[PDB]
Paper text:
Hemoglobins (Hbs) are iron-protoporphyrin-IX (heme b)-binding proteins that are found in all kingdoms of life. In all functional globins, an invariant His residue forms a coordinate bond to the central Fe atom at the proximal site of the heme cofactor, whereas substrates bind to the sixth coordination site of the Fe ion, located at the distal site. The aim of this study was to obtain structural information on a ferrous pentacoordinate Chlamydomonas 2/2Hb, [name] (gene ID Cre16.g662750), which is one of the algal Hbs that feature extended N- and, particularly, C-termini of yet unknown function. Here, we report the first crystal structure of a Chlamydomonas pentacoordinate 2/2Hb, the heme-binding domain (HBD) of Chlamydomonas [name] in its cyanomet form.
[name]-NC crystallized in space group P21 21 21, with one molecule in the crystallographic asymmetric unit. The tertiary structure recapitulates the typical 2/2Hb fold, but unusual features are observed, such as a kink in helix E, a tilted heme plane and a tunnel system possibly shielded by Met residues. The imidazole ring of [name]-NC HisF8(81) (note that residues are indicated in the Perutz nomenclature, followed by their numbers in the structure in brackets) is in a moderately staggered position, and its plane is tilted towards the heme group. In the distal site of [name]-NC, the CN– ligand lies in moderate H-bond distance to the hydroxyl group of TyrB10(32) (2.8 Å), whereas position E7 is occupied by Leu53, and the distance of the ligand to the amide group of GlnE11(57) is 3.9 Å (N atom) or 4.9 Å (O atom).
Numbering used by the authors: 12 to 137
Amino acid sequence: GPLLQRVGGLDVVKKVVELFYRKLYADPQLIKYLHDQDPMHLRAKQSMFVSWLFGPPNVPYTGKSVRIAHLRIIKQRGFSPEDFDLGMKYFEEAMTELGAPEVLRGEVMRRMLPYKDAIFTPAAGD
Ligand code: HEM
Ligand SMILES: [C-]#N
């Protein structure tokens, strides 16, 4: 049934996100963007998105614009689509390492994929 149960419940989601952030901060290309970001604060800010991500299907995300959220590191530090790809690799690795099957991982990653274009497509108002 629901994605949250299928992946193994809220304890698994928590550990996926924590492993995701461990991988992020250990990466020498992404640390440029994170060394001055409190990892606990960042996870807190990302929580609404993660709650939507493992929530009911089809519901559109209505939280803060992800381009706006990342626009400082884009303009000031060159955060690029290739850095976002690495982030998505690490989120997928975290799900794999905690035992989530590929069919579940593909479902989750397909929900996340549109947010690459969201972050990096210029919009009036930047
Ligand atoms: C790959 C390396 C990544 C870096 C360096 C990074 C960096 C950041 C930073 C610095 C913020 C802080 C924005 C703020 O506090 O105003 C943020 C917020 C956020 N990022 Fe990322 N990010 C990465 C990948 C991702 C990925 C893969 C996603 C998946 C969708 C994502 C989704 C979000 C969300 C939802 C927020 C919170 C927006 C809000 O405040 O509601 N980020 N990110
Ligand atoms: C992005 N955390």
